[PDB]
Paper text:
Fungal proteins that function during the infection process might be potential candidates, and Mps1 (M. oryzae mitogen-activated protein kinase 1) is such a protein that plays a critical role in appressorium penetration of the plant cell wall. Mps1 plays a role in appressorium penetration and invasive hyphal growth periods but does not influence the formation of appressoria. As a typical kinase, the overall structure of Mps1 can be divided into two domains, a smaller N-terminal lobe (N-lobe, residues Q5 to E104) and a larger C-terminal lobe (C-lobe, residues C109 to D412), with a hinge region (residues E105 to E108) connecting them. The deep cleft between the N-lobe and the C-lobe serves as the catalytic pocket for binding the cosubstrate ATP and substrates.
Cocrystallization of A378-0 with Mps1 revealed that A378-0 binds to the catalytic pocket of Mps1, while the three ring-type substructures of A378-0 constitute a triangle that squeezes into the pocket. The structure was determined at a 2.15-Å resolution. Structural superimposition with apo-Mps1 shows a root mean square deviation (RMSD) of 0.311 Å, indicating that only subtle conformational changes occurred in the newly determined structure. A378-0 exhibits a compact conformation for squeezing into the pocket: the indole ring is oriented perpendicular to the central 1,6-naphthyridine ring, the benzene ring tilts about 45° from the 1,6-naphthyridine ring, and thus, the planes of the three rings approximate an equilateral right triangle. Residues G30 and Q31 belong to the glycine-rich loop (G-loop) between strands β1 and β2 of Mps1, and the formation of the two hydrogen bonds results in an extension of the β1-strand compared with apo-Mps1. Second, one nitrogen atom of the 1,6-naphthyridine ring interacts with the main-chain oxygen of residue M107 of the hinge region of Mps1, which leads to a conformational change of the hinge and the emergence of the β6-strand compared with apo-Mps1. Finally, the last two hydrogen bonds occur between the nitrogen atom of the indole ring of A378-0 and the two oxygen atoms of the side chain carboxyl group of residue E70 of Mps1, which stabilizes the αC-helix in the “αC-helix-in” conformation (the side chain of the glutamate of the αC-helix points to the cleft).
Author numbering: 5 to 360, 394 to 412
The structure:
């Protein structure tokens, strides 16, 4: 066997025998998560039981998407690192276990706690997000659902992005970009306006917008655009950013939406200094650029990393790109039996994988020559 069975969330939770489940962390539409310790090494881990994987084609597609994306993005300081995967009952398996780097809080909880945060905390959080996002984007992946809840934080206030279940491909080739699959809808409060407005310009700017909403939420201590539905969300965005210009207006590819926006009364932009009069002016300038209504005017991740607000943190030599782009060919598979086969392949291949000039060099070279000279 080699495994232990725990009872959590009123169901079986079957883990590697090296681990002891310590604590229930949460449950969502896709499974349940517990914290655990490696009893030998005392290392902590989050164990995620992805549940009912083959109950719906959509659940199996999401599981396979998360499994592959998590592997692609291991080894970044600001991204939750996948350590292991396991399928304890492979005969008729309807679940997969992912073993991920454990994190004590999330940014939504920290903001909820009301604990005091300094402008330096805000800078650190935004910087870390953008570093992780630069890595993800450099692989031509859009996270697509960034929000305080998926930004995990430990006691050192170190921050890591999690949850690739809704991520989406991106391509500069319009035909390819339009074919990338989007099974689930992202979180309304944080979703970029060009999406509900059918700009058809699905771009990396959609994530930058979410980062802006997060910065705004840090500055005010509460969600910035808190729409109860999409009409309400639109009205709240426009009430802050104001009537867009004719060019932006004409990019609204949805006729009811364009009609609605065009007929609204004039609305002046509400300047962010009036809304956050105690904030650092550099924070509000970067906020203004991240919450540009029109994606074409929105700051890019790399420009944001170079913004004066983050100049203390910015070290381009310390902001790596991902070595390769991620391949989304799998998402054309529509047969669940084949998705099962592919998930087994992913898990077994990953399991074997994880179980496998400078001054000194110049002087070592010179030393070897000086010893092996004459004679
Ligand atoms: C908002 N988005 C998510 O929270 C997804 C949800 C998700 C994506 N795929 C899944 C498959 C099965 C079950 C859940 C998921 N969490 C993760 O990606 C994930 C990654 C590394 C983690 C490392 N340490 C802790 C957690 C954690 C889990 C919790 O439990 C919950 F249930 F996740 F809330 C609650 C708080 C936590 O940290 C403070 C972690 N969480």
């Amino acid at each position: 066997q080699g495994r232990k069975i725990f009872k959590v969330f009123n169901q079986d939770f079957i883990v590697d025998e090296r681990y002891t489940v310590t604590k229930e962390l949460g449950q969502g539409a896709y499974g349940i998560v517990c914290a655990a310790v490696n009893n030998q090494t005392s290392e902590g881990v989050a164990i995620k039981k992805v549940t009912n994987v083959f109950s719906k084609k959509i659940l199996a597609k999401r599981a396979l998407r998360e499994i592959k994306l998590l592997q692609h993005f291991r080894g970044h300081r600001n991204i939750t690192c996948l350590y292991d995967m396991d399928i304890p009952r492979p005969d008729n398996f309807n679940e997969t276990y992912l073993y991920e780097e454990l994190m004590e809080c999330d940014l939504a909880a920290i903001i909820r706690s009301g604990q005091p945060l300094t402008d330096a905390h805000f800078q650190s959080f935004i910087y870390q997000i953008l570093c992780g996002l630069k890595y993800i984007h450099s692989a031509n992946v859009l996270h697509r659902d960034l929000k305080p809840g998926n930004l995990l934080v430990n006691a050192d206030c170190e921050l890591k992005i999690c949850d690739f279940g809704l991520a989406r491909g991106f391509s500069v080739d319009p035909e390819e970009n339009a074919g990338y699959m989007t099974e689930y809808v992202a979180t309304r409060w944080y979703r970029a306006p060009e999406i509900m407005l059918s700009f058809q310009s699905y771009t990396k700017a959609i994530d930058v917008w979410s980062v802006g909403c997060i910065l705004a939420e840090l500055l005010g201590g509460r969600p910035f655009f808190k729409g109860r539905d999409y009409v309400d969300q639109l009205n709240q965005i426009l009430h802050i950013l104001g009537t867009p210009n004719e060019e932006t207006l004409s990019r609204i590819g949805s006729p009811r939406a364009q009609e609605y926006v065009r007929n609204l009364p004039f609305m002046a932009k509400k300047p962010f200094p009036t809304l956050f009069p105690n904030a650092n002016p550099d924070a509000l300038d970067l906020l203004d650029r991240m919450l540009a209504f029109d994606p074409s005017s929105r700051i890019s991740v790399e420009q944001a990393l170079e913004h004066p607000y983050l100049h203390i943190w910015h070290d381009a030599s310390d902001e790596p790109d991902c070595p390769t782009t991620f391949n989304f060919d799998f998402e054309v598979v529509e047969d669940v039996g084949e998705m099962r086969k592919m998930i087994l392949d992913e898990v077994y291949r990953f399991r074997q994988l994880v179980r496998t000039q400078e001054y000194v060099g110049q002087m070592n070279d010179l030393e070897a020559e000086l010893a092996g000279g004459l004679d």
